[PDB]
Symmetry: C13
């Protein structure tokens, strides 16, 4: 049952990565909305934000591949 | 369980991707409604944000194909 | 297992797409009500956003049909 | 197994579609309430909203019927 | 496995349909409370809303009956 | 498995009906508190709302009785 | 397998019935607090609301008894 | 199965009754805080609401205890 | 099986009673903070409320003992 | 089975007990923040509240030990 | 079962302990932010609160070890 | 089964530890934003809060290793 | 069981890590938006906060790999 091991690993990583970015991006959009001059700064905070937020889920994706292969 | 492993992966990736985009898009619509003059900036933040939020779910999808095969 | 792997894959994709569109459309309706003169740009944000929030759920349906067959 | 599969697909598609429409219609009723002049534009925005949101659930119903048959 | 199926499909259709109507009806009640003159207008949105929100749950029922009978 | 089915079907229809009525009645009570002169109007809207929300659960009940017998 | 069934049917009808009454009564208390003179009016709405809300859970309690005995 | 059943029917009836009373009592406490002169009215309304909210969970306890013995 | 039953019964009764009391106490504390002269009145409602909220969970505990022993 | 039962009974009692007083303490902290003169009164309600909220979860722990030992 | 039991007991104790502290600390941080003069008073309540919050989860951990050893 | 136990223990400890810190840190960031002069106290209050919130999750990780080894 | 073990340990660690970071990053973005001059201070809190929030999930990842290999 390595298939389920790759399913709920990549699946939970998908939910993790997507929602985390969605939260961060939304915060940037709302931030840019009321402070347009802070666009460049808030975009940088987003880019390093999603990078850290995707760290573990990517590792979970790697593990999901190691379970399959 | 190859079909189940391809169902959990693709299913959770669907929920991940769809909701994440919906969270991001809604933020832009609300932002554009507040600041129509930030239409171009917020839409750029959208496509960028959607691209990041779709990374892992798409990776979760190609895994669902590797499980099916 | 060939029917279960096509049920929770299509079921989750249904929940994914339907709710995602609902969130996006709701934002457009509320935006249009708040700012009627933005009816054009907000509706274009909808159709683009809905299309993006349907990418993976559509693939999840395609994968689901590949399970039954 | 086809009896259990067709149930989950149809069951979730029901949850998907019904809630999605409910969220959209809620926005239309609320929008029309605070802006009766925008009744027409919000109503057509509902129909195109329901149609897109009900798409995948309808497909999930077809798959459900394909599972059962 | 046919009794369980006919129950899940009908059980999830009940939850879907009842809540969907409740959300729509609540919006109609709130709107009528705010703008009593729009009672006939919002009541029409309710019936059109309920019917569309009841579509898939209704189909989920005939699928539940197809599994049972 | 017929006992388990009739249980879930009636149990989920119970959650469906009870909560749906609760949401509608709560809106009726709140609306009546806000605009008391609309007592009969909202109550009429409640009865129509309850009946429409009680539809599928009532159907899900006769399914439960059909599973038992 | 009838003990488990009669438990689920009665257990869910318990949660359904109790919470639904709580929501309706809470609205009655909040409304009575805001409008003390609408006590009897709202109390009548409560009794009618509770009766309709408890209708299906009571049926689920009967099915629970039928599953047992 | 009689043990496991009586657990669910009593455990869920516990969650049902306890939370429902909590919601009702909390509303009574908040209401009494706003309008101290409505102490007797709100308390009378509390007892009635609790009695109704506990009605079905009491039956669920009886049913569970009938499963045991 | 009597162990699993005693667990679910006592475990749910724990979650029921603890959260119920918490909600009631949280209300009494906020009520007392808001209106200090109603300290004795709200404390009585807390005790009466807790006794009613703990009624069923305690019975569920007794049942848990009846299943164990 | 006896181990699993001891887990559920103690695990749920942990979630019950911890969250219960967390709600109570948070209420006390907020109450003290607003009215620091009532710090003595509110702290009494906290301890009494915690004792009542931890009553059943502590019993659930006893059940867990009766199952284990 | 002993391993799966030691897991649930410790896992639920972790969820219980970590969240309950987070709730208390958040209240302390916000109270301190609101009233800097009460940083010492609220810190004591936090320490007392955490101790009461971790009590049962600690026992659940001890039990988890008793299941494991 | 030993791996499954080590999984649930480690997984739930991760969920517990991460989210708890997230709540505490978020409160500190919002506190620092509102009160820059209090960043010294709020950071200490964060570190103290984090250490307390990570107590049980760490032990749950230790147990996860004992189950595994 | 080693595949389900490594998956759950990695999957839940992903959900833990990603969401916890998302909450922390969002707080920093909103904080920077509210107070641009506190950018450097809040960026420090984010980096320290993320490192603490990712502590246990990373350990859970190590455990996940300590199940496979
Ligand atoms: C604190 C209050 C205590 C009240 C105690 C009330 C005692 C009188 C009520 C009847 C008790 C016995 O009720 C009975 O319980 C046991 C366990 O569930 C089961 O008993 C049944 O199975 C057991 C299995 O060994 C058989 O030995 C027994 O002949 C059979 O009747 C039945 O389910 C139920 O008929
Ligand atoms: C196996 C089943 C897996 C299901 C996974 C579903 C994950 C869905 C996560 C969605 C989280 C969205 O939270 P958010 O965008 O902050 O706002 C939510 C709205 N409020 C702020 C009002 C709460
Ligand atoms: C299994 C599937 C579960 C799906 C659950 C989906 C729940 C909803 C998802 C999140 C929807 C969006 O919320 P949000 O962006 O926080 O609100 C934004 C609104 N304001 C900006 C005004 C605050
Ligand atoms: C079987 C699984 C079924 C899951 C169903 C989940 C449905 C979730 C619906 C969630 C609707 C939320 O609406 P929204 O647009 O976020 O507005 C919220 C705006 N405020 C935050 C300001 C309130
Ligand atoms: C099977 C389980 C089904 C559960 C379904 C629960 C669905 C709950 C969805 C409704 C949650 C709230 O969102 P909403 O009222 O749309 O937003 C309100 C925002 N405005 C005020 C701006 C309109
Ligand atoms: C398994 C069974 C699960 C059933 C769960 C049912 C949950 C239903 C929750 C529905 C609650 C939301 O209601 P609504 O109409 O959107 O109003 C919300 C309007 N405001 C947000 C503006 C206040
Ligand atoms: C077995 C599972 C049972 C789950 C039951 C969950 C019930 C969820 C719905 C309960 C509340 C729905 O109230 P409503 O009328 O939408 O107004 C809500 C308006 N406010 C938000 C402002 C208060
Ligand atoms: C398995 C079942 C476990 C029990 C679940 C019971 C859930 C009951 C929830 C009932 C919630 C109270 O509803 P309401 O005051 O109409 O809205 C209040 C909504 N806000 C809190 C956001 C204001
Ligand atoms: C095993 C699962 C157990 C889950 C238990 C969940 C219990 C949730 C209880 C929620 C208590 C809510 O209180 P309420 O009366 O709606 O006040 C709301 C007051 N306002 C309307 C003004 C906001
Ligand atoms: C199996 C594990 C189940 C765990 C379930 C935990 C449920 C926790 C529910 C917590 C409900 C909190 O409600 P409350 O603070 O009275 O209302 C808040 C509204 N006011 C701010 C106006 C007071
Ligand atoms: C099996 C593991 C289950 C874990 C479940 C954990 C649930 C934690 C729930 C925490 C509830 C917090 O309540 P409270 O601080 O009174 O409300 C504060 C928030 N409102 C005022 C908006 C309502
Ligand atoms: C696997 C199980 C995972 C369960 C995870 C549950 C996480 C729940 C977190 C709930 C955190 C809520 O914080 P709180 O201090 O109550 O709100 C305080 C906010 N105000 C002060 C503004 C009211
Ligand atoms: C299966 C479990 C998946 C994980 C679910 C975890 C959900 C945690 C959500 C925590 C969100 C709450 O945040 P908080 O800090 O209370 O602030 C809220 C109060 N303010 C916004 C005013 C500051
Ligand atoms: C296995 C199941 C996985 C489910 C994962 C669900 C994760 C949900 C995380 C999102 C919850 C917290 O979001 P947030 O942005 O702090 O909003 C807090 C609410 N305000 C907008 C009002 C501040």
């Amino acid at each position: 049952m390595a298939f389920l091991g790759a399913a709920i690993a990549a699946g939970l990583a998908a939910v993790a990565g997507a929602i985390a970015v969605a939260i961060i991006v939304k915060a940037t959009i709302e931030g840019t909305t009321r402070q347009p001059e802070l666009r460049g700064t808030l975009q940088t905070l987003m880019f390093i934000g999603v990078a850290l937020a995707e760290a573990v889920p990517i590792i979970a994706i790697v593990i999901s591949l190691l379970i399959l292969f």
